[PDB]
Amino acid sequence: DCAWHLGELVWCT
Amino acid sequence: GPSVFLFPPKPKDTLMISRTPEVTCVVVDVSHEDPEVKFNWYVDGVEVHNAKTKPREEQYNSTYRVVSVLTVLHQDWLNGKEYKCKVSNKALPAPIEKTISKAKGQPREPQVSTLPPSREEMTKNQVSLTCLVYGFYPSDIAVEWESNGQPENNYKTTPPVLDSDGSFFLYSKLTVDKSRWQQGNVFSCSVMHEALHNHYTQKSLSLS
Amino acid sequence: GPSVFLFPPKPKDTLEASRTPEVTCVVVDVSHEDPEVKFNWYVDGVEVHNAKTKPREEQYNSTYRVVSVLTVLHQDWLNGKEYKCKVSNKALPAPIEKTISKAKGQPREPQVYTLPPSREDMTKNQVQLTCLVKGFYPSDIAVEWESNGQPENNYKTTPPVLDSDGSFFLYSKLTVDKSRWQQGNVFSCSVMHEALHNAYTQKSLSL
Ligand SMILES: *[C@@H]1O[C@H](CO[C@@H]2O[C@@H](C)[C@@H](O)[C@@H](O)[C@@H]2O)[C@@H](O[C@@H]2O[C@H](CO)[C@@H](O[C@@H]3O[C@H](CO[C@H]4O[C@H](CO)[C@@H](O)[C@H](O)[C@@H]4O[C@@H]4O[C@H](CO)[C@@H](O[C@@H]5O[C@H](CO)[C@H](O)[C@H](O)[C@H]5O)[C@H](O)[C@H]4NC(C)=O)[C@@H](O)[C@H](O[C@H]4O[C@H](CO)[C@@H](O)[C@H](O)[C@@H]4O)[C@@H]3O)[C@H](O)[C@H]2NC(C)=O)[C@H](O)[C@H]1NC(C)=O
Ligand SMILES: *[C@@H]1O[C@H](CO[C@@H]2O[C@@H](C)[C@@H](O)[C@@H](O)[C@@H]2O)[C@@H](O[C@@H]2O[C@H](CO)[C@@H](O[C@@H]3O[C@H](CO[C@H]4O[C@H](CO)[C@@H](O)[C@H](O)[C@@H]4O[C@@H]4O[C@H](CO)[C@@H](O[C@@H]5O[C@H](CO)[C@H](O)[C@H](O)[C@H]5O)[C@H](O)[C@H]4NC(C)=O)[C@@H](O)[C@H](O[C@H]4O[C@H](CO)[C@@H](O)[C@H](O)[C@@H]4O)[C@@H]3O)[C@H](O)[C@H]2NC(C)=O)[C@H](O)[C@H]1NC(C)=O
Secondary structure, three states: OEEEEOOEEEEEO | OOEEEEEOOOHHHHHOOOOOOEEEEEEEEEOOOOOOOEEEEEEOOEEEOOOEEOOOEEOOOOOEEEEEEEEOOHHHHHOOOOEEEEEEOOOOOOOEEEEEOOOOOOOEOOEEEEEOOOHHHHHOOEEEEEEEEEEEEOOOOEEEEEEOOEEOOOEEEOOOEEOOOOOEEEEEEEEEEHHHHHOOOOEEEEEEOOOOHHHEEEEEEOOO | OOEEEEEOOOHHHHHOOOOOOEEEEEEEEEOOOOOOOEEEEEEOOEEEOOOEEOOOEEOOOOOEEEEEEEEOOHHHHHOOOOEEEEEEOOOOOOOEEEEEOOOOOOOEOOEEEEEOOOHHHOOOOEEEEEEEEEEEEOOOOEEEEEEOOEEOOOEEEOOOEEOOOOOEEEEEEEEEEHHHHHOOOOEEEEEEOOOOHHHOEEEEEOO
């Protein structure tokens, strides 16, 4: 899975 | 003589894979007669070569400000690597060295919880939404607020405070018109930190 | 030569009738050859003579630390009187002067709100109790916790933070064992500020 912050990619495992 | 200041990346830049974290070696009081500065860079003692010198800037006090920027990999900074800048200049009997790195110590996951306005605050034109973040180490962090995908900028965050178990805590307070709270809008506290799953967590908060 | 630092009284000292607030003029880097420091104190420009000098203290880095303490009245400090310390020493080209007083600006009264721990927080051994203190000016404040008349010392308080309306806020966090919280004990957040009624308020928090 991935995390997004205000549409901008944070990190994926 | 010249003096050197070495600055770490912004936490956000080390935490967002879509950003570019960099370390910055600032040299002040560079003389008009000897403006030439040599930079050597080291990563855990191993010399690297991909630094770039920013445009020279003359200062109001007749000295130059010379700056070298080294790009760094997210995981090297997060893995605790040590970055050394070495500065040489003729007005400097010996070269100056500085090292910075992430604070040492096992990382701990922030505990993020939101807290609604006190009942007693409900009399005011404006209400405080609280985000408490605790048990995190190291202290490098970003906290922001949003609602409906749009940033909510009317907040303030306390600096991190060292706790008695050796972790850090902070609080973030977003202030909103009481009417926006009553109207049932959902507000979200966003935390970014190395020790969270994917560096990111979000906690929401609305009228019950 | 020497360097001078002038320190205000502790907020709690100016806010409790029983305590004694003082202004403190610390002189570091005093040499061994000319250790004599002369102090002149002025209150709104008017020289006073009741200051008292601390024992001289050897620092072991070639210097003395010399301190002059001036006792001040609660009302004087709170009414914004300015306190000037003037330090003269043979190793100074000219005397050094410093001035200190309460931050200027209309005092505003703290709003004190206790916030229970989140239900998502309840799987740990200890819970976090929050006291939000906002809307206060100046930033001089003291915050404490107690329960059933007894002081509760296991807390941390953030430094005052300047808020968007020009007032200050802080949070204080008391950590207690989950059981004590669950058993319905009352915990209290005590706040001292010049702009509170009687320079004091208390707010309590319980399951
Ligand atoms: C001649 O003039 C120059 C320039 O003076 C400037 O202009 C004049 C008119 C005045 O207004 C000055 O106040 C101006 O600065 C003088 O140069 C100054 O010398 C100082 C020391 O003599 C030096 O002080 C040290 O500052 C450190 C923090 O500096 C920060 O913050 C200040 C403002 O708060 C800012 O001005 C500085 O540039 C610096 O800002 C950071 O820059 C870095 C690097 O670019 C940024 O990091 C990067 O950011 C990007 C994003 O763009 C990206 O995220 C990258 O990944 C990231 O790396 C960073 O974001 C900036 N931060 C901020 C907040 O802006 C102090 O920490 C340091 O303290 C340390 O040392 C002290 C003892 O010396 C100790 O007390 C302490 O414990 C610390 O160890 C120093 O106080 C000034 O920075 C410096 N000014 C500049 C502009 O460089 C010069 O002295 C004078 N000479 C003579 C002979 O008179
Ligand atoms: C030789 O050594 C001496 C002594 O130093 C000690 O011994 C050496 C050998 C080392 O081991 C040191 O680590 C030891 O400290 C050196 O003296 C030092 O000089 C420094 C600079 O010259 C000076 O820095 C300035 O400090 C200010 C803050 O001082 C506070 O906090 C520090 C620590 O954070 C503390 O050490 C000080 O004592 C002082 O503490 C406050 O004291 C006041 C007065 O007692 C207290 O207030 C009173 O409290 C009583 C009850 O207790 C009562 O309630 C009264 O009503 C009340 O008034 C107060 O509680 C104390 N606060 C704290 C937190 O403890 C800084 O503000 C200042 O910065 C400012 O100026 C700078 C520019 O000049 C700016 O950069 C900055 O932003 C600010 O504007 C300075 O940094 C050190 O204080 C001083 N140390 C001591 C102990 O005096 C000496 O330098 C050295 N000489 C040589 C040649 O090497």
